[PDB]
Structure 1
Amino acid sequence: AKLVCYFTNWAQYRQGEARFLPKDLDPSLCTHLIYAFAGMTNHQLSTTEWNDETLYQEFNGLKKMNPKLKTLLAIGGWNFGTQKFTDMVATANNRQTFVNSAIRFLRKYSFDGLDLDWEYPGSQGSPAVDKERFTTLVQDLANAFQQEAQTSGKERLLLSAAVPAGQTYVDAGYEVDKIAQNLDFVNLMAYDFHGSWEKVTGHNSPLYKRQEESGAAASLNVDAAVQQWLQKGTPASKLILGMPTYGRSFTLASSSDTRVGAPATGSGTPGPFTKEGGMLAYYEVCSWKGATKQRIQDQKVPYIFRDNQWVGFDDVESFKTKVSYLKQKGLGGAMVWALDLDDFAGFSCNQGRYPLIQTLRQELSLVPRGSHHHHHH
């Protein structure tokens, strides 16, 4: 099994106990660590934060403590836009520029691979031709990584992609069966299914549909997303199920209707550390005083409300349920967004350090046999 965990290079700017740096990383928690995010300049891989080079050394230096660990660098992300990807894949020359830059950059900074996080080919302003061009990019990278391994004698660079769960995006951008052959693994973003862009409450990451749902809404859940990627041609062993250590919040129209599907007037109040309305870290919901926790019985995930605030999130129990699910489907492991949104320092939830991600590690049977300081949940 794999446990693929994302580090974010902006978590270093959170205040107080929520501040997160590579030293807060446990080298033995995950099997693969992915660094979010790199960018692109003149079709070449580039840093995005003033101290990335410092952080890259600390991050990849974790492999000194755990030589089994693999690291990857993720390019793009949800605020990166599409134009730089579109322009880079538009010609063979630009793709070659990018591919060669990626090899040099990853080797220079001691990363073991590249994770593609374009949101998304064929959508959000990207033209329809980018669906086939993304396929070509993935093929170009895979082929070049193979060649560089042969010529250099070094372990081949890994290639992964973070891919959407929603059918609209999948069909506009992803030749699933073709790309799956060339990717080492596929990081399924099985979250952001619902949120405050909608006028009623709904869960960030439900495992199954609600009985009431129909039409396209009935596929906005983890099981449907997994089945979609499998049926469209992803080998189960390559499909890595995303898991959120955050929730999505709503302001309710009335504190007297707290159901899933109740009317909402907008995003929930921002959290005290993450400061982004509509989102909360697990550590910002796990210890919410005077709140009422509930479970959505069809969907196998919790929500919590207090006054006119409603949050759908994941807890230890829902992570256990989702790992049981992924094992039943024969998937390659779990992926987690993100290290810095779990209670990484044990400062909030009274569940020790990394309670959610340790739950994933346990349930995947990835606990080191040498480990002394782990906590079973």
Structure 2
Amino acid sequence: AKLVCYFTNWAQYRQGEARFLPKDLDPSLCTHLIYAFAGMTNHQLSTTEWNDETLYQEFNGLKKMNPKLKTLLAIGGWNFGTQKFTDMVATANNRQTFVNSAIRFLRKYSFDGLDLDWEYPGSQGSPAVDKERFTTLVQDLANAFQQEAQTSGKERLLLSAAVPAGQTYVDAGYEVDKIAQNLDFVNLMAYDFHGSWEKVTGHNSPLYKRQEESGAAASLNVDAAVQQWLQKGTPASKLILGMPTYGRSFTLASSSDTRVGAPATGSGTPGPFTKEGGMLAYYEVCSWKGATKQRIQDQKVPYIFRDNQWVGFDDVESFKTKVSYLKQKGLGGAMVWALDLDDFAGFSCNQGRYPLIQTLRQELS
């Protein structure tokens, strides 16, 4: 099976021990390492950090310690927006500029493939035509990669994309049917289903729906998302179940009511290391003294709370489960976001190195 794990640029800036660099990457923990992120400048693939070139060298260097390992460069993300994307795909001449810069950029730093993270084709201010163009981008990259390998005699570069679990976004700009055939594999980011952007407490990545929960909110869970993509026409072998190594927090209305789906005034206060409201890294979560861990029967997932803070995350057991669901449905493997967010150096969870992801590696084989 495949174990796809994301590495992020900005992790290098975390203070204290939370600092993450390639040096902290275990070359054997995952089957595929993905670098987040790479930008675009003049329809061309280009770095985004002052020391990306040195990092690209380290990241891909791991392959000397494990030749079986595969690395891919990811372009986009949430903050990337859609402007630069929609532009690049509008005209075949700018599109071809990209396809070519891709092939050169990747071959220059030793990347085995490229991960497309357009969020999202035909959404967030993206013409409903981009849905079609995205397919064209996928097909173009696909052909170029197929051609290049034949004339260069090197291992064909890989092409994957990070797709959404959001019913809307899905039907909004993804020709599942078609793209699924030009992508080596599909990373379903089955997380962020619920968040501080809802005035009522919810869980980040829920496996199934709550017994007392329906309507459109019945789609907001892993299973639903997973069954969706499979039906739309994605062979399961090419479907990678993404899993979060972070959780989502809410500042409760009153420490009196902590019912999953309780009134929340807003996002949980920010963590000491990640420093972002409504978001907590696993290693920060398990740092809660006198917390109150709990589980959601319906949707096999925990969540702790202390006073007015309520954070829904995944722990070792919730990962064991999901890996199990994964296998059950016959999926191609698991995908994890993100490396730097697990307790990568066992400095606060008291569970060793990469607690969450190691559980994945174990169960997967």
Output the CA distance in 1 between the equivalents of 2:212 and 2:246: 25
Secondary structure at the aligned position of 2:218 is classed as helix
Paired with 2:312 and 2:74, the residues of 1 have a C-alpha distance of 27
The Cα shift of 1:216 comes to 1.1
SS in 2 for 1:131: helix
Unaligned runs of 5+ in 1: 366-377
- Cα deviation 1:35-94 (Å, max 9, x = unaligned): 000000100000000000000000000000000000000000000010000000001111
Looking at structure 2, the residues matched to 216 and 7 of structure 1 have their Cα atoms a distance apart, in angstroms, of 33
1:257-281 deviation digits (Å, cap 9, x = unpaired): 0010000000001000000000000
Q: What's 1:82 paired with? A: 82
Residues 97-153 of structure 1, C-alpha deviations (whole Å, 9 max, x = no match): 000110000000100000000110100001100000001100000010000001100
CA shift for structure 1 position 215: 1.3
* CA distance in structure 2 between the aligned counterparts of 1:343 and 1:32, rounded to whole angstroms: 19
- Matched residues in 2 for 1:142 and 1:127: separation? 23
Q: Distance in 2 between matches of 1:298 and 1:205?
A: 13
SS in 2 for 1:17: helix
Superposed CA deviations along residues 229-286 of structure 1, whole A, max 9, x for unmatched, are 0000011000000000000000000100001000000000100000000000000101
Q: Distance in 2 between matches of 1:187 and 1:61?
A: 24
The separation in 1 between residues aligned to 2:269 and 2:34, in whole angstroms, is: 29
Percentage of pairs with the same residue: 100
Deviations 1:157-207 (A, max 9, x none): 000000000110001110001000000000000000000000000000000
SS of corresponding position for 1:232: helix
Q: Which residue pairs with 1:240 in the alignment?
A: 240
**Deviation by residue 1:337-377 (Cα, 9 ceiling, x = unmatched):** 00000000000100000000000000001xxxxxxxxxxxx
Q: Which residue of 1 aligns with 2:171?
A: 171
Alpha-carbon shift at residue 32 of structure 1 (Å): 0.1
Name the SS of the counterpart of 1:214 in structure 2.
coil
Which secondary structure does the structure 1 equivalent of 2:178 belong to? helix
SS state at 1:249 partner? strand
**Which sections of structure 2, spanning at least 5 residues, go unmatched?**
none
Deviation by residue 1:300-327 (Cα, 9 ceiling, x = unmatched): 0001000000000000000000000000
Task: Tell me whether 1:265 sits opposite 2:261 in the alignment.
Answer: no
**Distance in 2 of aligned mates of 1:6 and 1:35:** 6
> Any runs of at least 4 consecutive aligned residues in structure 1 with deviations exceeding 3 A, and if so which?
none
Q: State the alpha-carbon separation in 1 of the partners of residues 44 and 51 from structure 2.
A: 18
1:190-269 alignment, distance < 5 Å: 190-269=190-269
Task: Please give the alpha-carbon distance, in whole angstroms, between the structure 2 residues aligned to 1:147 and 1:259.
Answer: 56
Give the distance between the partners of 2:363 and 2:286, measured in 1 at CA. Answer: 20
Report the Cα offset of residue 287 of structure 1: 2.6
The TM-score, its normalising length taken from structure 1, stands at 0.96
SS at match of 2:217: helix
Aligned residues: 365
CA displacement at 1:213 relative to structure 2: 1.4
SS at the partner of 2:186?
Answer: strand
Distance 1:33 1:179 in 2: 22
